Design a protein around this ligand. Structure first.
Ligand SMILES: *C(=O)[C@H](CCCC)NC(=O)O[C@H](Cc1ccccc1)C(C)C
Length: 213
């Protein structure tokens, strides 16, 4: 059992945060995009800028939480599209666009903390799932290929949000198919395969969630 939403057209191209710590915004957007495709058949970029500028509970370019983002989209009656609310790599005034909403959100669900099997079930039944991991390691920052696994990764040190678009096995190594938001020059075309069922490496399942659409 393995799934690759990229193969089903549930994933938009890899984005680049620019000089802004908006990992969580891209992560949330990637998740909503997946549900939008599943629900309507259309694959299009949602606005991470809309979240950066508007999610009051977060710190824009200084960090944030996907859950808060999903809550905002629901309470806000929607999120605009990238075309209607362009990414600028820096936090600005929350702008309202009457004809900008491209997607909706009915709330969200969290994956039971540390449960990698629950994470697998969610990814399979829902679609791409937002997750938080410890990305402070040089090995991760400079990851190139294969299945990433470092014994120094700290599951108690979540500092980066990415998107789980699937999971599988490579050369007998189970893994999570992760979409990053540091451009296509990072990792393998912007993607990284992270160890799966390897004792919850990097805390991949400590802060996972997806939106209800
Ligand atoms: C991902 O780009 C951001 C970068 C912030 C560091 C400049 N990391 C992040 O949002 O982590 C959040 C928790 C957090 C960390 C620091 C400040 C505020 C919030 C979770 C997604 C781990």
């Amino acid at each position: 059992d393995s799934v690759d939403y990229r193969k089903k057209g549930y994933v938009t191209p890899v984005k680049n945060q620019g000089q802004c710590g908006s990992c969580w915004a891209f992560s949330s957007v990637g998740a909503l995009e997946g549900q939008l495709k599943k629900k309507t058949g259309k694959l299009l970029n949602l606005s991470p800028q809309n979240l950066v500028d508007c999610v009051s509970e977060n710190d824009g370019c200084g960090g944030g939480y996907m859950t808060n983002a999903f809550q905002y989209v629901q309470k806000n009656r929607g999120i605009d599209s990238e075309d209607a609310y362009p990414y600028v790599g820096q936090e600005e005034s929350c702008m309202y666009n009457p004809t900008g909403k491209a997607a909706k959100c009915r709330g969200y669900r969290e994956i039971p903390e540390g449960n990698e099997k629950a994470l697998k079930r969610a990814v399979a039944r829902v679609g791409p799932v937002s997750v938080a991991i410890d990305a402070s390691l040089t090995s991760f920052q400079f990851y190139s290929k294969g299945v990433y696994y470092d014994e120094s990764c700290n599951s108690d040190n979540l500092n980066h949000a990415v998107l789980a678009v699937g999971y599988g096995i490579q050369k007998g190594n189970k893994h999570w198919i992760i979409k990053n938001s540091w451009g296509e020059n990072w990792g393998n075309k912007g993607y990284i395969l992270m160890a799966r069922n390897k004792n919850n490496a990097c805390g991949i399942a400590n802060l996972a969630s997806f939106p209800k659409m």
